[PDB]
Amino acid sequence: TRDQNGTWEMESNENFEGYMKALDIDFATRKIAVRLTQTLVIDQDGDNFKTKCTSTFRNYDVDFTVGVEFDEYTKSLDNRHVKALVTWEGDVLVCVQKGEKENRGWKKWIEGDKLYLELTCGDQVCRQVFKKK
Ligand SMILES: *C/C=C(C)/C=C/C=C(C)/C=C/C1=C(C)CCCC1(C)C
């Protein structure tokens, strides 16, 4: 399914530290981020996504339309300008963030009752799994 709608509660979060370090997120921020439970709320209407990440610390939204390139300034993350593009490869939603970091972006897909999110930057891969609330 391409339907990724839902309130998704983080079940596991593998190598978030390595991914954040590849992005040059500061030590103290990584230390806090790595311990927090994330909730990811996805509102998906056709090609339009409104994505909201929440934790007890930082909360972060990003909206995009599938197949429409968009500039991002990754404020409150690594503070870089990237050109972002989110497209479908089969039932995998693929984001590429073109810019300074190589292999930067993510892949997101549904398997059964779970949402999988693989974040990449440089040689690092972070694997997150969420379950619907
Ligand atoms: C569809 C899935 C999306 C848009 C995933 C977005 C992921 C984030 C906004 C992640 C944010 C963070 C980090 C990369 C590290 C610092 C802590 C967070 C949660 C602000």
Short mmCIF file of C-alpha atoms and ligand atoms in Angstrom, two decimals:
data_model
loop_
_atom_site.label_atom_id
_atom_site.label_comp_id
_atom_site.label_asym_id
_atom_site.label_seq_id
_atom_site.Cartn_x
_atom_site.Cartn_y
_atom_site.Cartn_z
CA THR A 1 0.00 0.00 0.00
CA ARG A 2 0.99 3.59 -0.61
CA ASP A 3 -1.29 4.70 2.22
CA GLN A 4 0.96 5.98 5.00
CA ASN A 5 -1.74 7.92 6.86
CA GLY A 6 -1.75 7.63 10.62
CA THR A 7 -0.40 8.46 14.02
CA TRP A 8 2.72 6.36 14.22
CA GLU A 9 4.41 5.60 17.52
CA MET A 10 8.10 4.77 17.42
CA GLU A 11 8.78 1.13 18.29
CA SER A 12 12.50 0.93 17.55
CA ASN A 13 15.28 3.28 16.43
CA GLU A 14 18.52 1.71 15.23
CA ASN A 15 21.75 3.69 14.69
CA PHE A 16 20.09 7.10 15.14
CA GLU A 17 23.40 8.18 16.68
CA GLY A 18 25.45 7.29 13.58
CA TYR A 19 23.00 9.02 11.26
CA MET A 20 22.93 12.19 13.41
CA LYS A 21 26.72 12.25 13.64
CA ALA A 22 26.96 11.94 9.85
CA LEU A 23 24.77 15.06 9.66
CA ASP A 24 26.97 16.89 12.20
CA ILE A 25 24.29 17.31 14.82
CA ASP A 26 26.04 18.42 18.03
CA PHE A 27 26.92 15.92 20.76
CA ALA A 28 24.48 17.22 23.38
CA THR A 29 21.60 17.25 20.92
CA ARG A 30 22.36 13.68 19.83
CA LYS A 31 22.54 12.54 23.44
CA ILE A 32 19.00 13.76 24.10
CA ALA A 33 17.54 12.79 20.74
CA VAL A 34 18.70 9.19 20.92
CA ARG A 35 16.67 8.44 24.06
CA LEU A 36 13.35 9.98 23.04
CA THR A 37 10.16 8.28 21.88
CA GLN A 38 9.00 9.84 18.62
CA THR A 39 5.45 10.08 17.29
CA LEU A 40 5.12 10.63 13.56
CA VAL A 41 1.75 11.94 12.36
CA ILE A 42 1.24 11.61 8.62
CA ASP A 43 -1.66 13.38 6.87
CA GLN A 44 -1.68 12.17 3.27
CA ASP A 45 -4.18 13.44 0.70
CA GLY A 46 -3.35 12.30 -2.83
CA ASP A 47 0.17 13.56 -3.49
CA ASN A 48 0.10 16.01 -0.59
CA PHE A 49 1.82 15.07 2.64
CA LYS A 50 1.81 16.90 5.95
CA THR A 51 4.27 15.17 8.22
CA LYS A 52 4.58 16.00 11.96
CA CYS A 53 7.24 14.56 14.27
CA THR A 54 6.83 14.99 18.00
CA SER A 55 8.76 14.10 21.12
CA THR A 56 9.09 15.67 24.56
CA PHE A 57 11.95 17.79 23.24
CA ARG A 58 11.94 19.04 19.65
CA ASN A 59 8.86 18.91 17.39
CA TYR A 60 9.26 19.06 13.63
CA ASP A 61 6.91 19.38 10.65
CA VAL A 62 7.54 19.10 6.94
CA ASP A 63 5.03 19.25 4.11
CA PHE A 64 5.70 18.22 0.56
CA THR A 65 3.98 17.14 -2.62
CA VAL A 66 5.12 13.91 -4.23
CA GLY A 67 6.98 14.63 -7.46
CA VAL A 68 7.48 18.34 -6.81
CA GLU A 69 11.01 19.47 -6.01
CA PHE A 70 11.22 21.71 -2.95
CA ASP A 71 13.98 23.66 -1.26
CA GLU A 72 14.56 22.92 2.37
CA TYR A 73 16.50 24.76 4.97
CA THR A 74 17.02 22.12 7.64
CA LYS A 75 16.56 24.57 10.50
CA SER A 76 16.87 22.99 13.95
CA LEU A 77 18.69 20.01 12.48
CA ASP A 78 22.00 20.53 10.68
CA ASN A 79 21.14 23.96 9.23
CA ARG A 80 21.78 23.28 5.56
CA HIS A 81 20.13 24.06 2.26
CA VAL A 82 19.11 21.02 0.25
CA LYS A 83 16.95 20.43 -2.81
CA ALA A 84 14.44 17.80 -1.83
CA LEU A 85 12.33 15.47 -3.94
CA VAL A 86 9.97 12.73 -2.78
CA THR A 87 8.80 10.09 -5.25
CA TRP A 88 7.39 6.56 -5.32
CA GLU A 89 9.38 3.49 -6.27
CA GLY A 90 6.73 0.85 -6.15
CA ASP A 91 5.30 1.16 -2.64
CA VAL A 92 8.50 2.68 -1.24
CA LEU A 93 8.40 6.44 -0.74
CA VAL A 94 11.85 7.80 -1.54
CA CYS A 95 13.20 11.17 -0.48
CA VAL A 96 16.45 12.49 -1.93
CA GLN A 97 17.96 15.63 -0.37
CA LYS A 98 20.54 16.91 -2.84
CA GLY A 99 23.28 19.07 -1.36
CA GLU A 100 26.51 18.89 0.61
CA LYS A 101 25.94 15.48 2.20
CA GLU A 102 26.08 12.46 -0.09
CA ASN A 103 23.43 9.73 0.01
CA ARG A 104 21.17 12.01 2.04
CA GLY A 105 17.46 11.30 2.35
CA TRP A 106 15.14 8.51 3.41
CA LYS A 107 12.91 5.63 2.35
CA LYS A 108 9.56 4.93 3.96
CA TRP A 109 7.23 2.00 3.50
CA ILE A 110 4.40 0.03 5.07
CA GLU A 111 4.76 -3.67 5.97
CA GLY A 112 1.66 -5.08 7.62
CA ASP A 113 0.74 -2.95 10.64
CA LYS A 114 4.12 -1.22 10.71
CA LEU A 115 5.78 1.79 9.12
CA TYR A 116 9.47 1.51 8.31
CA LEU A 117 11.71 4.52 7.91
CA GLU A 118 15.31 4.26 6.75
CA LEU A 119 17.23 7.53 7.07
CA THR A 120 20.55 7.83 5.20
CA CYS A 121 23.47 10.24 5.23
CA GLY A 122 26.95 9.51 3.94
CA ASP A 123 27.80 5.92 4.84
CA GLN A 124 25.28 5.77 7.70
CA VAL A 125 21.85 4.12 7.80
CA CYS A 126 19.30 4.59 10.58
CA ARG A 127 16.37 2.15 10.71
CA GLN A 128 13.21 3.13 12.53
CA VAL A 129 10.01 1.11 12.93
CA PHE A 130 6.67 2.60 13.98
CA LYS A 131 3.32 1.05 14.85
CA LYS A 132 -0.06 2.73 14.41
CA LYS A 133 -1.52 4.27 17.57
C1 LIG B 1 8.04 10.96 6.44
C2 LIG B 1 9.12 10.93 7.44
C3 LIG B 1 9.75 12.05 7.82
C4 LIG B 1 9.42 13.39 7.22
C5 LIG B 1 10.82 11.99 8.83
C6 LIG B 1 11.33 13.10 9.35
C7 LIG B 1 12.38 12.99 10.35
C8 LIG B 1 12.73 14.02 11.13
C9 LIG B 1 12.05 15.35 10.99
C10 LIG B 1 13.82 13.83 12.11
C11 LIG B 1 14.15 14.78 12.99
C12 LIG B 1 15.22 14.74 14.01
C13 LIG B 1 16.50 14.35 13.75
C14 LIG B 1 16.99 13.95 12.39
C15 LIG B 1 17.56 14.34 14.83
C16 LIG B 1 17.22 15.37 15.89
C17 LIG B 1 15.86 15.00 16.46
C18 LIG B 1 14.77 15.15 15.41
C19 LIG B 1 13.60 14.28 15.84
C20 LIG B 1 14.30 16.60 15.34
#
